[PDB]
């Protein structure tokens, strides 16, 4: 702990803590004219992260067995075009969301698109390579 | 008027009948309700409590 560290170690620990505490300070300064939106809730965030992890699990054997960064980047570009269309849809539907029910509906739609259409599209792509 | 709006309304009515045949009784993609039929936006958005990351 802090009492068990020397002066330089205390300096390093304080440095790391302060560098981690950036966002906290920015929480005090908010702008009036900004367009507020209901953010994606934590459970929906975790579900979307799990969907992305599932996509990465599907992708991993092929890209790790690929020895060409050009091919890996091509796969990434195609999957990113698909996911970016879906992300644009999600952002459009979330920014206009009137409440957490609407935000959850949009996040669930995006996750289902990843889990249903995304996996099939990625599987076809990886079968191409 | 009949020429112009005949072609336009023919297309509109074709769309209407096509969406009736599929029993689609929801509202189309560009329906803007009056303020009495619109969901108000929730202003109160309390951010999550800041917490130092263990990692």
């Amino acid at each position: 702990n802090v009492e068990e560290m020397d002066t330089i170690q205390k300096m390093n620990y304080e440095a790391t803590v302060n560098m981690g505490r950036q966002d906290l300070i920015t929480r005090e300064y908010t702008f009036y004219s900004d367009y507020e939106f209901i953010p994606i809730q934590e459970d929906r965030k975790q579900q979307m992260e799990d969907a992305l992890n599932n996509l990465h699990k599907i992708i991993h054997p092929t890209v790790t067995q690929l020895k060409k960064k050009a091919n890996v980047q091509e796969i990434q570009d195609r999957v990113f075009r698909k996911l970016q269309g879906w992300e644009g849809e999600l952002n459009t539907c979330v920014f206009s969301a009137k409440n957490v029910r609407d935000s959850n509906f949009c996040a669930d739609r995006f996750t289902n698109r990843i889990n249903t259409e995304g996996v099939e599209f990625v599987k076809q792509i990886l079968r191409e390579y | 008027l009949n020429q112009k709006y005949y072609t336009h309304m023919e297309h509109l009515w074709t769309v209407h009948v096509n969406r009736l045949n599929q029993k689609i009784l929801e509202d189309p993609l560009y329906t803007f309700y009056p303020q009495e039929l619109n969901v108000p936006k929730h202003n109160i958005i309390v951010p999550t409590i800041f917490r130092d990351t263990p990692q």
Binding site: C93, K98, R101, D102, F105 | H16, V17, L20, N21, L25, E26, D27, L29, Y30, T31, F32, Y33, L37, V39
Partner: peptide, 28 residues
């Protein structure tokens, strides 16, 4: 736009429910 299904007031459906039983729309 896209009115969300839970936020979609099916006004058309309402007008379809008030429609008589013989109008061509019901045939459609």
């Amino acid at each position: 736009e896209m009115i969300l299904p839970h936020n979609n007031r099916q006004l058309a459906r309402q007008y379809f429910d008030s429609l008589p039983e013989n109008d061509i729309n019901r045939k459609y």
